[PDB]
Amino acid sequence: AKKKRWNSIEEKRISQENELHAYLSKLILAEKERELDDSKHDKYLMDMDELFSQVDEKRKKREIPDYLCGKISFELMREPCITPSGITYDRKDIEEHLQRVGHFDPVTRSPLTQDQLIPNLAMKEVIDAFIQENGWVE
Amino acid sequence: AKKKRWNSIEEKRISQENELHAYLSKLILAEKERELDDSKHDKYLMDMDELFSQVDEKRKKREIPDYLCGKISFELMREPCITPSGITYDRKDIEEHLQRVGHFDPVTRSPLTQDQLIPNLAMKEVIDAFIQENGWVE
Ligand SMILES: [Cl-]
Numbered sequence: 722a723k724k725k726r727w728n729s730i731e732e733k734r735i736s737q738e739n740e741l742h743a744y745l746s747k748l749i750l751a752e753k754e755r756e757l758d759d760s761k762h763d764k765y766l767m768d769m770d771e772l773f774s775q776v777d778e779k780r781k782k783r784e785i786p787d788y789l790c791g792k793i794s795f796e797l798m799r800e801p802c803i804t805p806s807g808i809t810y811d812r813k814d815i816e817e818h819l820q821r822v823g824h825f826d827p828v829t830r831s832p833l834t835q836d837q838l839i840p841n842l843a844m845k846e847v848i849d850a851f852i853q854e855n856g857w858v859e
Numbered sequence: 860a861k862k863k864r865w866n867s868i869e870e871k872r873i874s875q876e877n878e879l880h881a882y883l884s885k886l887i888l889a890e891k892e893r894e895l896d897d898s899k900h901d902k903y904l905m906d907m908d909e910l911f912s913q914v915d916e917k918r919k920k921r922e923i924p925d926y927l928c929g930k931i932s933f934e935l936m937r938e939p940c941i942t943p944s945g946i947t948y949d950r951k952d953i954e955e956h957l958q959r960v961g962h963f964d965p966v967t968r969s970p971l972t973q974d975q976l977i978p979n980l981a982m983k984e985v986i987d988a989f990i991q992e993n994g995w996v997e
């Protein structure tokens with residue numbers, strides 16, 4: 722929703738990392754200048770860039786694990802529930818299927834009814850911990 | 860086991876980060892010297908340290924999520940299976956309990972028998988992805 726504040730917070734971060742990265746690349750090159758005025762430096766620059774480049778590669782984020790998404794909704798599950806076949810779906814989606822499509826396990830075809838659905842408490846914790854450590858979500 | 864190779868691989872990393880970190884702190888201070896020879900630099904040093912300090916704070920690792928551990932084994936689950944009450948245990952541990960302790964859900968006390976155990980396929984994927992992205996495990 723109005724959670725566009727995550728972009729603002731990371732805006733201030735990205736901004737500082739860029740300033741630090743430029744500053745550091747300046748000191749380096751300048752040193753290379755002084756040295757080649759009287760290289761190993763070129764290597765320090767690569768690793769130095771890679772360091773900031775990596776802490777930016779993971780910033781690409783948007784990588785919502787597929788194993789945290791429903792088989793029906795194809796997206797992060799809010800209420801993960803498992804069937805007796807061991808397949809986890811998002812409650813709203815599965816209860817939708819069992820009421821609109823039919824009384825069968827979307828994947829195993831095994832006979833199924835809403836009352837057999839079991840709350841996957843463990844998965845709910847995994848997803849919650851995921852949504853916390855990853856504000857870009859939602 | 861002999862997977863002590865993870866310590867060797869990260870040994871080479873940690874070693875390079877330290878060398879880069881020292882080198883960078885040298886260029887900085889030297890610059891501060893030249894400036895204070897004719898500070899904002901002190902701030903660049905803090906953030907620069909924090910940068911390497913952070914990529915080391917997470918290296919503390921050993922943080923095996925509790926929600927990935929069994930209620931009985933109290934440790935990373937190899938074969939996560941859920942009960943009809945929605946509680947996930949490691950197979951070996953739960954089947955041990957149902958055969959040595961009694962036919963009841965360790966936490967909900969609800970009546971239980973090995974044949975009711977359901978394989979928590981979703982959790983198995985979560986843990987597998989965890990063991991991969993974290994070699995220090997095992
Ligand atoms: Cl789903």
Ligand SMILES: [Cl-]
Pocket residue numbers: 928929930931932933947948949952953
């Ligand atoms: Cl357990």
